[PDB]
Design a protein around this ligand. Structure first.
Ligand SMILES: NC(=O)c1ccc[n+]([C@@H]2O[C@H](COP(=O)([O-])OP(=O)(O)OC[C@H]3O[C@@H](n4cnc5c(N)ncnc54)[C@H](OP(=O)(O)O)[C@@H]3O)[C@@H](O)[C@H]2O)c1
Ligand SMILES: NC(=O)c1ccc[n+]([C@@H]2O[C@H](COP(=O)([O-])OP(=O)(O)OC[C@H]3O[C@@H](n4cnc5c(N)ncnc54)[C@H](OP(=O)(O)O)[C@@H]3O)[C@@H](O)[C@H]2O)c1
Lengths: 253, 250
């Protein structure tokens, strides 16, 4: 079950995955917009600056770890016919309908597709992946063996494994993750500060601002722009706040 | 060190305080708008249906545990001039400038005033008060011994003891507790539910919503109406959310 895994987008998340993958014994290759050559040398990863070169490497699985906003450009510019053989493409974007559509549209037909969302990251899984949730949709899988072996990377780490459609994920995520990021950004904008009399609830909010804020704005933009279900949730949040606020006014009166 | 403590407003919080007070060996009695005779029986303490009888008892400390909204009605209705002796009044309202101003205005001059806010409750302190915060302001203390003994109730339970002015409390509380409740209430209106793919952060929010919603609307109302700093904080929240929305809409 040891795999040759190639990572596209060697940013914070890609790096986070790579650490565990290396620990498990997989052999890694990576490519990215920015230069990660030294970090890759440290880690034992074979880095290719140029995507064309990356695509000719001996890879079982290609994992797309770029930002949600950039996936279209990135995929669009890969010379996919450079692929030596049919390969599983995995995405890990925080939204799911979009990578699914793009990959189905853009990839060679004979390449498999696994759309995933590990519902955790460096800020929330500092000490291991156990009991963190890994969502996946087997969008186009023919080589079950390779697909299983990849999914096992998460399973062996103790993740709660959830198989779900990309649509179902976006629906759920809009109601849950998107809202949470939104509150977290709002708290960030407020620059909330600990006080000498924090409630436990306030404490958790301060922690939330901290974790939510350590994500890129591109990431949080992606959650909204590319989830068709997000806009309604944002309205629901506003509507709810206003409902509460008016009830207060009625009480003032 | 043992005190005769009388609770006014035997609701959720007053019951909560009483449990611990009883455990410590104080002698507790209660009075309230509603009839808590049975619950008091179960708990082992004497309930006074009428406030006059409560007031004429042998009592060392009266703890005001009514809602913030109701404190003025309650106090204004108590026949205060029936007290046998000078007595320490403690409030535990979630806002502090109002009870301070009210008590100073309305109480007999010889009665002491300790204004407090335990920053915890039955939903956050199920397993003990240890390391939860207790805020207090010694507004009008002449009998330091009784006042110290009362304070010790919190200290001996391991509370983080914080002495502060009522104004500072209300300023801080507006930025923290009130915001938290408002966010919790908003989430309640949305009726947020757990999903199969909850993030850790979302899980914290579902919990917060569940905890915040267990308070009375009266309590939440109270945080807003009687904290002069609250309204600006609501504005800050509302404005921030708007700002965030603008970055997205672009
Ligand atoms: N906890 C997490 O962070 C987490 C958890 C689950 C899923 N995800 C998902 O994992 C992906 C990566 O997340 P992230 O946290 O590392 O941060 P991110 O800001 O969403 O994405 C960063 C990566 O995107 C690349 N990138 C951005 N714009 C690009 C462009 N125009 N062209 C080419 N590459 C571009 C960056 O490349 P360079 O570094 O080379 O410049 C970097 O590798 C995202 O899709 C995110 O939704 C993240
Ligand atoms: N975790 C907490 O709940 C917590 C923590 C810290 C401080 N506090 C404070 O403790 C006080 C009590 O809180 P709570 O949680 O028990 O709930 P609450 O809804 O704020 O207040 C309930 C109490 O108020 C009494 N009351 C309400 N309206 C009244 C009226 N018009 N006339 C006479 N009595 C009236 C009720 O009397 P009856 O039950 O007899 O009807 C009950 O004893 C509040 O000031 C609150 O801010 C609460």
């Amino acid at each position: 079950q040891s795999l040759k895994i190639g990572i596209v987008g060697f940013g914070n998340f890609g790096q986070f995955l790579a650490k565990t993958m290396i620990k498990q014994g997989h052999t890694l290759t990576a490519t990215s917009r920015s230069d990660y050559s030294e970090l890759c040398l440290q880690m034992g990863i074979h880095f290719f600056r140029d995507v064309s070169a990356f695509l000719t490497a001996d890879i079982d699985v290609i994992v797309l770890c770029t930002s949600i906003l950039s996936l279209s450009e990135v995929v669009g510019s890969m010379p996919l016919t450079s692929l030596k053989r049919p390969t599983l493409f995995v995405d890990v974007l925080s939204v799911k309908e979009h990578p699914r559509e793009l990959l189905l549209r853009e990839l060679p037909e004979d390449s498999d597709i696994l759309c995933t969302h590990p519902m955790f990251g460096p800020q929330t899984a500092k000490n291991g992946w156990t009991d963190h949730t890994f969502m996946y949709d087997k969008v186009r899988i023919r080589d079950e063996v390779i697909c299983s072996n990849f999914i096992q990377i998460f399973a062996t780490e103790g993740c709660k494994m959830v198989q779900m459609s990309c649509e179902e994920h976006d629906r759920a995520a809009a109601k849950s993750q998107f809202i949470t990021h939104t509150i977290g950004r709002t708290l960030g904008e407020m620059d909330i500060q600990s006080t000498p009399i924090d409630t436990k609830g306030f404490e958790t909010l301060v922690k939330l601002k901290e974790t939510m804020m350590r994500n890129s704005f591109d990431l949080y933009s992606g959650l909204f722009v590319y989830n068709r279900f997000a806009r309604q949730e944002l309205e629901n949040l506003e509507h709810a706040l206003h409902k509460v606020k008016e009830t207060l006014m009625i009480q003032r009166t």
